[PDB]
Every structure is written in C-alpha cells, then in structure tokens.
C-alpha cells in the first residue's frame, strides 16, 4: 500500500522532531543543506540552513516563515528545497496519480520503501521516493523527466529522529522575528488534476504601467502560472527549461502568454495554445 | 595574530589522529556522489575507526590498532595490516606537514564557511610544479578537515571530499565500543636490492620499500618494485624483462597513472598518483648497472 506509506511519510514530516543533513543535486552542483523540524506548543518549528558559503537561513514558526541572508511572511511550510512533495496531501492526489512500489533498498544506512509517484495521464514529471522504513522520513527524492532523466535530486547524508530539540530551536521558539480580480481569458486545456489557486493583476516594471494577469494553478504537487500581457512587436515564441523551471512564451493574437512552472515543455505549450480569449 | 599555513595543517593532522569524531561526507568524482560515514576514536591508547558506505550494499572497513578488516556483500571478510583505512579520508589528512614543508608550499587563501563552520582555506602545492595539488578547508575550532579538493596542474578537480554533517568530542558510540572487543576476521598473510635506480625523482620523494615478486606467468618472471613516497603522494617503479609484446603506453584514470615505457631490454611501468608527464620523466631516467 504505497498510497498509505506516502501518507505516513507526510505525517512523519509534520509531527516528528528530526534533523536531516542532506544534499541537493542539480545542474548547479551539489548543495549542502540542513533541515530541522520540531513541534513546540502545538505549532510547527523549523530551520533550513545553507551549510557552505554565506549563511543563508530560513525559519518557520507557526505560519511565520522568516528569511535571512531580512523579512518574514506567511506560509504553512518552507519552500523549494526540502522536497515540497513531503508536505503533499497524497489522498488529494490518488484519483489521478499512480503510486508504484519498486521494492526496498538501503539509503542512508536504512532500509527504504521505494515508490514512484506518476500522474496517470502522462502529462507531468514524476518523483521517485525512498522512505525510511522505520521513521517514514524521506531518505532520497528524485524528480524525473518524462524520459526518465533526473532534473533534481534530494539525498539525505545523515539524520536523527526523535531526539530532543536543539538549543537553536529551543531559542527560535521564543525569539522575536521580523514580521511583515476577473480576467477575460481562461485555459481550455489543463492536465487532469489541476485547479486554480489564485488570480492577480500586477503592474509590470515598465514606463507604461502595463498590467500582467496571472493565474496560479496547482495539482497538489506541481504548480505553474499562466501569465498574460498585451503583446508588443518585441514579443516572441520561446521555450526555456533549466531544471524544474520551464518558461514557455507564445504569442497568439495580441497577447503574450508565458507559462512558468514545473512542467514538461510539451505540456506548457499545449496549455499556452489552448487559452480562449474574449 | 594567526599561524602560518603549515602550523594549521599540522593541527588538522593532529586533530584527525587524536580526537573522537564522526564525519558524514560525500566523495565526488567521475563515478558520481558517494555517501560515506567515518568514525574515529581512541580506546586503550589505540586507534579505532570505521568507514561505512551508506547506500547500496553494506561495504564496511574497520581499523583496530594496526589491523584493517574488510566487510563485503555476501563475502567472507578478511583482515590486513595497515596504519589507516584507505579511500576514506583524503590521504592529505594523515600527512606529516613538518616533513613536507621543505618541498611544498602551504598557501593561505583565507576563510570561508563549510558545513556551518568558519574554515581556513589552504593550498598544498609541490614547489617544483611536478605534482597534483590539494586545497583544504579546515574547521577553525576542531581543526578537522571540512572539505578537500584534489586538483590537476591545470586546476581541474580530480576528486572532492566534502563533509555534510559531523560531530566531535562526543562519546564513543556503543557501535564503536562493540567493535573494540569484537572478533575480527583472521589476519590474511623479496627483501632485496636491484641493478637499477631512478636518476630523476621529483624533489621530496624517497624510497619506502623494495620487493621482488614472481609474476603470474608460465615462466616465473620476476618483477622488481621500488615504492616511493614524499609523505603525501606515492608511486611505484616496476621493472621487468621486456618481451616482444611490451609497448609504450599511458593510462590515467583518476589518481591512478599507469605509465609503461620500454627502454633496452626492460619494461618499466610507473604506477601512482602522478601527472603523466612526471611519471614518464621518471621512467625515462632509470639507469642500469649503477
Ligand atoms: C525530448 C527532449 N526534451 C525536450 C528534453 C523532452 C524531455 C521529456 S519531457 O517532456 O519530460 O520534458
Ligand atoms: C596537458 C593536458 N592534460 C594532460 C590533459 C592535462 C593534465 C595536466 S596534469 O596531468 O599535469 O595535471
């Protein structure tokens, strides 16, 4: 029951005290991170630290996420390294994802269940998760191409679980932190599972205050934005894929459509070229 | 009010040999990113160590005094004599920097954060431009190595050692305490002078041992070996009787260079952590009948 195992991983991630020492591998290279999580006063407490170079820090205290290099904002979880699929509602996903068992294997000196998370309609990237058989915490996570090429890799190098909370986190618990629309277009085609999260109109940083209209879509796991703005003679069709960011611009009619998010290029384009106007 | 680079390096060496610690590190090279764990302690005025491969089959290597035991996937384990576990730590760590200094330069490149620690950054370069070099990041408190790169003469990195998490001075683990008293696999099993010597060696190198060994051939063809080291890098000069099938060739993989040259009736093959150019220069400077 992979579905159940994945739900358990999510739950372990949200409710245990733990420290993960892990590396993030992608085209940029091998980055060294530390994540600490705890529960204190029935409230989440977390720290993501960049280990090498300048001291980039991010902390979570309840729904306050404070960033450091010096602000804070609201959110239910730290984003985009610590594998956002760890905070995924897998019950929400099951109708349109397959969870596939690929057996057990040693990662980080632990026996792990290995599970593929694939969207049924062949439309998105996929994950494969190695989870600790005891703690249920994620030991390794690969983000994969539709062609099986790896875009991003999360690998735990050392960890501990169930220990009492660091002086750091014990401090952070009390320490004071920094604290801080209707469109004329819709997408006619979205991959099975996606639904709108928010809409916004934003003035572009240009001499004309030219609006850009954005819809944020998510399927509980992957997310992207559809951005529309009035076309100019300098607007062009183009595709850029780096890692998990695809930027797909297409010009249709008098509009500049740009899709930004975790999507195979093909899918982004298919969305772009299915927006109905008027 | 900060020490010369050589004093720092000596400190790191000392820290490595006398502290109890655990390094969780990755070694990066053309193979990929491999995840290792190294534990070191001293118990009964004796070294105690464990190198564990963290992913896949459970490859383990352990040190107890001067015995090194090798544990493997579905294999009978064995023990050898050795002063330290190899392919663990970069060899750089066991180095005697007092010894190296007449022929190496130790160059400060400042301080930087590795593994949430302020580190001194130091290049270790051989003065005669003859070898690969290292750059070390060393924890400013513990003195332990936090990162180590081995570099081409062109600055390309051949191998990288990076600690991801570590602890120091913490109690010797009950796993390690078990090892001290554990049953180790039984220890598993020539002294001569030759007619040839290398006339050119990089500044610093000196002979470690000599041996004559019968090759695994129908004729019991001897092969004569001199092991050289400079305290950091090491190589062997191997001579054997040339055959019609003996050819000049160079193979460099990572930090193994195999350089064969045939001069006169001899097949000379140099094996070790040396730039190809240097290996060849040694091979083609052996005299015979000295
Ligand atoms: C086939 C070549 N590219 C564009 C990289 C496609 C890779 C597969 S996909 O759809 O997941 O991006
Ligand atoms: C000079 C070109 N090659 C041999 C490829 C670069 C290696 C330089 S080396 O071996 O001395 O570091």
UniProtKB/Swiss-Prot annotation, chain A:
Nucleotide-binding keyword on record: no
Record has DNA damage as a keyword: no
Annotated InterPro entries: MucB/RseB_C, MucB/RseB_C_sf, MucB/RseB_N, MucB_RseB
Loss of function: phenotype: About 2-fold increased sigma-E activity, 2-fold decrease in stability of RseA.
Recorded GO CC terms: outer membrane-bounded periplasmic space; plasma membrane; sigma factor antagonist complex
BP GO annotations: negative regulation of DNA-templated transcription; protein stabilization; regulation of polysaccharide biosynthetic process
Highest taxon of the lineage: Bacteria
Spans annotated as Interaction with RseA: 185-278
Sorted UniProt keywords: Lipid-binding, Periplasm, Signal, Transcription, Transcription regulation
Activity control summary: Binding to RseA is inhibited by LPS fragments; phosphorylated N-acetylglucosamine (GlcNAc) with N-linked acyl chains are minimally necessary to disrupt binding to RseA. Once RseB is no longer bound to RseA the latter is susceptible to DegS degradation. Thus if periplasmic LPS levels increase the sigma-E regulon is induced.
GO molecular function: antisigma factor binding; identical protein binding; lipid binding
Classification via PANTHER family: PTHR38782, SIGMA-E FACTOR REGULATORY PROTEIN RSEB (PTHR38782:SF1)
Domain text: The N-terminal domain (residues 24-203) is responsible for oligomerization, while the C-terminal domain (residues 222-318) interacts with RseA.
Family stated for the protein in its record: Belongs to the RseB family.
Listed name of the protein: Sigma-E factor regulatory protein RseB
Gene symbol of the encoding locus: rseB
